[PDB]
Design a binder for this molecule. Structure first.
Ligand SMILES: Cc1cc2nc3c(=O)[nH]c(=O)nc-3n(C[C@H](O)[C@@H](O)[C@H](O)COP(=O)(O)OP(=O)(O)OC[C@H]3O[C@@H](n4cnc5c(N)ncnc54)[C@H](O)[C@@H]3O)c2cc1C
Ligand SMILES: Cc1cc2nc3c(=O)[nH]c(=O)nc-3n(C[C@H](O)[C@@H](O)[C@H](O)COP(=O)(O)OP(=O)(O)OC[C@H]3O[C@@H](n4cnc5c(N)ncnc54)[C@H](O)[C@@H]3O)c2cc1C
Ligand SMILES: Cc1cc2nc3c(=O)[nH]c(=O)nc-3n(C[C@H](O)[C@@H](O)[C@H](O)COP(=O)(O)OP(=O)(O)OC[C@H]3O[C@@H](n4cnc5c(N)ncnc54)[C@H](O)[C@@H]3O)c2cc1C
Ligand SMILES: Oc1ccccc1-c1ccccc1
Ligand SMILES: Oc1ccccc1-c1ccccc1
Ligand SMILES: Oc1ccccc1-c1ccccc1
Lengths: 554, 559, 559
């Protein structure tokens, strides 16, 4: 066999990599050891970044069709059991009107709930459709790197045959026990039971959290509303009884599905790249599910890498473009492993406000409910203490908008404009802050195209660089054309303004851009700003060719 | 003829007064000179306070059934003409996601567009159903007041007969040229210009991919009556005939959608407010006491709130439960609102000339001058850039009269004998008090909205209150409020419902939002008037706290 | 006081008459004894004919905004109690897919549930807006007729004054005990029993996974007012107090949903129809001429159609465009409908005893007897099977009064001087004329509905017609109808709009459904009255065809 990129693994990271590469016209072979996509719902929270990426590749509408929308995700309930009485509720997944505003303003996309069970075949199929070779029941065994490429040994679980594939690059998207990361010698620094069942819980959810949390803490998570379910906590037909005491009524017929377990050794790779091997997804960040960062960061790893491999494979970028994958994504790996872990400590204070031990008996828990309804000033302090504790759990339940969106890249693939880092006005984990400084994601605002709403993001992406400016920045069109033909790279210029293809109909682009109208923003295929000019002066214009060459390593 | 309250006028203020008075079991006769409710769409923006009032009396659902919802009000377009090129668009009626958040947080209710044409009969019919006598084609001619009541002379435009009505009180809800205000001798201030309104019908392809309450042409307005067949053009005694059809054509920018030229009507305004709204047994409300520009859509809404302020007070006085001095609080609380909206509606006018100024245009531009301004606007120079920025800045500043004024709509601050001060100073406003609502539980402020639950289903704090009575809100540790309330209730012969909000209770602070908004400990209490204003606040359930309730209620009632 | 038409009554018939008369530019005074529109929900089923009439006068959209739609009316449940076990369910209000097809094909409009409580003010307000004078708290006492008009004596319940009105005509729309019918000396026939109605409020979990207009308990009815908070219980001068709350409880089958016992009202019916509806200058309509059971919901609907039949006729006569003999056609066309619905509503009653009979029950079963019938119903024997089949057969037969009667609702067949016979025999009905609508374009039948297009957007044949005037429909090869129509129109001084339906025309037979329904060649013509009835039909555009139009119109107008 032979291919440009061997992608080991067909999870979210591998499948997205395959899809992106196949789109840019790069030959890839994506393999998977197992028969199918993941049989479990597993990760389910899709954040705005992943939806933006789906939007870019044309899959957002299908995703939205299958996904449960944001407004059926917000009603988070803390209770003894679902049919029982509830401690109280928190506005999960940005369902508070203020959080919702902040959500809406940050992206054209929105949170939704789309279990991996469904996300995966949607991306695996799109990858093969766009031109990726996809091969399941095929196991990566090892590889040898020379400085011309790589030779991997594969075991075929259908024919029993063992064969070699010659590639230029590997992508290790092979999950939390990546043999690819092990063979690349990547340095790393820094459990639960799931039960799928089926029961009509419509009556006791009609009147719309994405999750029910029962205090040992047991999560009742919506798979499909509201007939397919999953219980998760920190087994035989007893699992039925486990689903009965968590529902707090054995009155609904329950259909006990598959029972699995999930163990996690929380670590991140300090480096994600070794020679021609690039690792991504769970392979470089293993962590708790708090905040639902896993799948989303993994897909974003793929989006960062694919266009860079394509430019290098095409000879348009020097191979040093690829150094920026480690530079930009490794800090995200460490960040999310640390954040997901930190969120765990938001939970003991809930038990403590109850005046409970880590493991409460049934008499101890019923006693805490009593103390909670106590008409004394001490009862009041108790109710306030409980509320304060529950509120603090939001950081892992949709509160973490800043973590999700505030990527700040520093690398050779980002050309500094000379401004200092403005930092963040408010807490950078809770709150997204838009920035057009190179290294930040292009901000979303609405423009119009034929008086119909279009995002700044929809002007960009599609595997190419895009330059955004205004009418007084007309010279950018010519300058980008000279740079484009000399460097042999596509540079799409959009001049936003009255009477143009795209129009700053609400004035929001002028508002968000941070530069004069004649300034320009150069946006990477992955939606990150890589160059910013403040005006269309001679010196401003001349710097474009310098920045693009620099980004390309030429 | 004999009644307790003669209501002169069946517009929004009169009709709401009749409905509330009837719901409170007060006999009223509401009259109207004309044969019907108002033929024209007229006022159409229904703000959250009016919707709350509709919510309280059970008309909010029917109101929403008929009204156009907030999400179809947001695209205001500034353009040369409808089918022409836009200057740009503003996120009117709190349609910006941030403005929307602030909107949603403030009230269980929402902006909608409901023309008077439909609002009026909905309230007039409810008033008659609830027990009010309603008599149209009946004209108030005058009255004489004595110590015990008032005798008005009426002219019946059906029988030609002239007859008298004996009433204890007269409501002057008779509009911008109130004869009742004139006869009561109300002083008016702030006297410091008309508009023509053309209805037409046309299926307007071009007002869909936006969805907006209005289109402004540079100044003509193309406002929505029904989306999007019905239509009305407005601009600043004038005749006009069939060229009005032409006048519709060049404001639509094309003449190939058939249009049906409906009724043509003028509206003149002599901007003024009454500095006092009450004289003896005469109370004036609505346009009768505040005459102003339509900017901000404050008219109808403030008028309905005038009625909501007065009705429960008249009912208590007529029932002998409150002394007649309770009615003094109507002028104290509503007159400042009257002056406020007249001044605000006027001020919003001066936000439009800078738009012409940014375009380097005269107040009255020809079609060459305007076509030139459009060219200059697409100029690829730094001076073109400055112009585009200047235009945007000007257009943005118009938002204050087009949904920006949330603060104006909601930040009522009452000081009177019907509000018992709790001893705290006025915290004032953190942000601009015209643009931004600030919730407050200090006496004199409207009860803040948050969501509670009742059987795990969401209910507003507002839904715990109102219904023509006083309500006291507290938490579990404030249990003593129930008994204290009962003693005060039986002794003063006044209804006072206590809600203990908490776990295992009828109403539950499920989101913790009540503890967060209340500004007091759980054992504290808020006393809410029938009109949803807080009239008393205790910080805890101490003896001194508890004993003050009776004092406050007696004080509010004037007893 | 002086008017053209004095309308006695402001119920559905009177209000619709006032609205139509005002739309036709006829001066009317509509009076009502009481202070408001009807406080009770009362009639609530709005059939397609009433919706068509609302469509014609532009109120269908607001009607639909308020009404519950057909898809939420279909699950009728027969049960012991609400929270108890069902006997079974019928596909009420044409909810069976076949019945739904037949429903949809018949009309552009659809069944909805709109309580009188809301229908009435919507029409009363429209009548006043369109130009009618409306005067409530005003009581008709009597009248004397002479050659030139009528003088009625009125009592004003506001002023106490008694006064006279001079009118050319009096409409008796004054309900089931019409004093106007009594004074006109109308004969009544078919004299060959009351019901109590209890309003209450409760959130009823159990009426959701079905979605039905009513619940029948074995006989009590639990009918929907609003889905599903509002409620009303109905069963066959009686007092009742708080046990009515208990009476609600055992009909709900549980006592753990809070309920709020509203107003309690009785309804007695003396079943009769007027054999004639007109005497001199007096015309009676609505309950005044047909008093009957609610089975089938025919009352309000037939009453509104009475008004629709009469109004355009009065307008032509008052304008001098038609001779007064045109009004003779009101009795000829509407009296048979009156007798028909009284007999049908009554007949539907006898469909309920077989239900008790299939259950081997007495007319009045105890709770042991009923519990035994439920046991027998689950018996695993062939005799149990026969019982289950017998129950189903009985329940199915009740559909005729619960939406089965499409034929009754729509198959009006007019014979009078206001319908010009075309010489064809009566084709009669292929299927049962009570159950099934049969479309017909023969003179005397309602214009059939099919979809055409106008700018490729769907429009009903009905939407081409109505609006207070005559309309002529034809196709391209019938072009000569336009000129012929114009000559007849100018000579008789009557408006007559011609629509040429075809390719490239204003209205297009896009689906070929007009050619399919018309029963005539393309060059043929249908003349449609303002009330949507076909009054003339020509088979082609021959000379003899064309010349007959003038003859028909003169004949219809009595000239
Ligand atoms: C069992 C389980 C349950 C989870 N539940 C949750 C949850 O509830 N909430 C949450 O937020 N996250 C959850 N996660 C984490 C989540 O699934 C993501 O972190 C994400 O799936 C990681 O994507 P990858 O695309 O990086 O990993 P993977 O989805 O694990 O994909 C790795 C792929 O490589 C394949 N592979 C591995 N080794 C080889 C080999 N030698 N040769 C060929 N193919 C190979 C695997 O078959 C697989 O297809 C769960 C993960 C697991 C494993
Ligand atoms: C033509 C027109 C267009 C308008 N357009 C807008 C708009 O676009 N936006 C906006 O915000 N506001 C608009 N308004 C103003 C708006 O309708 C409100 O200010 C509001 O209706 C005032 O309520 P009232 O209830 O205070 O006044 P009114 O609605 O005017 O009611 C007064 C009532 O008293 C009756 N009456 C008066 N004198 C007597 C008497 N002597 N005897 C018996 N009855 C009497 C009147 O007939 C009427 O029923 C418009 C007003 C008019 C007239
Ligand atoms: C309590 C009740 C319950 C009903 N429930 C149902 C039901 O469930 N289903 C159903 O199909 N039908 C029901 N009906 C009957 C139904 O309301 C219709 O038959 C219809 O309203 C009759 O229309 P009208 O317009 O013909 O009669 P009405 O609606 O009765 O109108 C008559 C009008 O004339 C007025 N009037 C009478 N006498 C005088 C006078 N001397 N002077 C001035 N005004 C006068 C009356 O006040 C009223 O305004 C019910 C009727 C009643 C009374
Ligand atoms: O599934 C999740 C999504 C976001 C945040 C936390 C979780 C989760 C955390 C622990 C067990 C089950 C689910
Ligand atoms: O109808 C309006 C609502 C809010 C603000 C302004 C207007 C308006 C103001 C002047 C002319 C037409 C409409
Ligand atoms: O309200 C109805 C509508 C259609 C058919 C019958 C009824 C009815 C008949 C008797 C008592 C209650 C309701």
């Amino acid at each position: 066999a032979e291919t440009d990129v061997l992608i080991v693994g067909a999870g979210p990271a591998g499948a997205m990599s395959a899809t992106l590469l196949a789109s840019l016209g790069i030959r890839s072979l994506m393999i998977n050891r197992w028969r199918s996509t993941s049989p479990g719902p597993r990760s389910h929270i899709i954040n705005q970044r992943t939806m933006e990426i789906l939007r870019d590749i044309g899959l957002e509408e299908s995703a939205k069709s299958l996904a449960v929308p944001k407004e059926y995700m917000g009603e988070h309930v803390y209770a003894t059991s679902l049919a029982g009485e509830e401690f109280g509720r928190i506005p999960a997944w940005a369902s508070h009107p203020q959080a919702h505003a902040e959500h809406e303003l940050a992206s054209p996309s929105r949170y939704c709930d789309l279990p991996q069970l469904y996300f995966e075949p949607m991306v695996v199929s799109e990858a093969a459709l766009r031109g990726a070779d996809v091969r399941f029941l095929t196991e990566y065994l090892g590889h040898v790197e020379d400085q011309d490429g790589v030779t991997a040994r594969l075991l075929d679980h259908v024919s029993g045959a063992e064969y070699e594939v010659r590639a230029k690059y590997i992508i290790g998207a092979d999950g939390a026990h990546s043999l690819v990361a092990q063979n690349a010698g990547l340095p790393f620094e820094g459990g639960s039971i799931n039960i799928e069942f089926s029961a009509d819980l419509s009556s006791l959810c009609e009147h719309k959290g994405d999750m029910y949390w029962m205090f040992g803490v047991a999560a009742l998570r919506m798979i499909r509303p509201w007939n397919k379910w999953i219980c998760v906590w920190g087994t035989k037909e007893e699992a039925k009884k486990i689903i009965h005491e968590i529902i707090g009524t054995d009155e609904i017929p329950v259909e006990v599905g598959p029972i699995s377990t999930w163990t996690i050794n929380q670590q991140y790779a300090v480096r994600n790249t070794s020679g021609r091997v690039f690792c991504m997804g769970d392979a470089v960040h293993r962590h708790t599910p708090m905040g639902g960062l896993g799948l989303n960061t993994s897909v974003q790893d793929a989006y960062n890498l694919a266009w860079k491999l394509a430019l290098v494979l095409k000879g348009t970028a020097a191979p040093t473009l690829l150094d920026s994958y480690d530079a930009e994504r490794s800090p995200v790996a460490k960040q999310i492993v640390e954040r997901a872990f930190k969120s765990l400590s938001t939970f003991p204070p809930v038990f403590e406000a109850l005046s409970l031990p880590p493991a409460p008996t049934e008499s101890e828990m019923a006693e805490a409910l009593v103390r909670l309804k106590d008409a004394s000033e001490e009862g009041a302090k108790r109710r306030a203490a409980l509320r304060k504790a529950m509120d603090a759990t939001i950081i892992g339940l949709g509160g973490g908008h800043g973590v999700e969106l505030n990527q700040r890249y520093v690398s050779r693939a980002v050309f500094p404009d000379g401004t200092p880092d403005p930092g963040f006005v408010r807490d950078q984990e809770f709150f997204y802050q838009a920035s057009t400084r190179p290294g930040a994601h292009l901000p979303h605002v609405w423009l119009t195209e034929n008086q119909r709403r279009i995002s700044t993001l929809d002007l960009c992406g599609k595997g190419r660089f895009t330059l955004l400016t205004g009418l007084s920045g007309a010279a950018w069109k010519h300058e980008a054309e000279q740079v484009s033909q000399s460097l042999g790279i596509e540079l799409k210029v959009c001049v936003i303004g009255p009477g143009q293809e795209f129009v700053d109909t609400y004035g929001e682009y002028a508002k968000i851009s941070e530069i004069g109208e004649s300034g320009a923003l150069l946006v990477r295929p992955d939606m990150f700003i890589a160059f910013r000019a403040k005006d269309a002066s001679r010196e401003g214009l001349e710097q474009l060719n310098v920045a693009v060459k620099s980004i390309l390593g030429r």
